[PDB]
DNA sequence: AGCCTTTGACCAGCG
DNA sequence: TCGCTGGTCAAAGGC
């Protein structure tokens, strides 16, 4: 989605099977954060994003 | 080296 | 107070 991710947990939630797995932008200082839900298939079914990145994309 | 994913255990917050 | 649940740490490993 054209920002860079360092992956920092996984978890199994309730209800929904498939697991979450929560990622962390890594430009310097910048708080975004995402959590993201696939698919057995690897498709997207859930999305969230925790903040704004305060920077241009790579 | 430096950066990433995996994994299991710890945190908090709310009922 | 307790304990489940979602969010996070950080070590151990891979690249
Ligand atoms: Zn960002």
Same mark, same amino acid.
């Given at each position: ?5 360092? %992956? ?6 309730? &209800? ?5 797995? +929560? ?10 954060? %995402? ?6 298939? &690897? ?5 969230? +994003? ?9």
């Amino acid at each position: 989605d054209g920002y860079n991710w360092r %992956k920092y947990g996984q978890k199994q939630v309730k &209800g929904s099977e498939n697991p979450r797995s +929560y990622y962390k932008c890594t430009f310097p200082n910048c708080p975004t954060k %995402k959590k993201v839900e696939r698919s057995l298939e &690897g498709q997207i079914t859930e999305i969230v +994003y925790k903040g704004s990145h305060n920077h241009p994309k790579p």
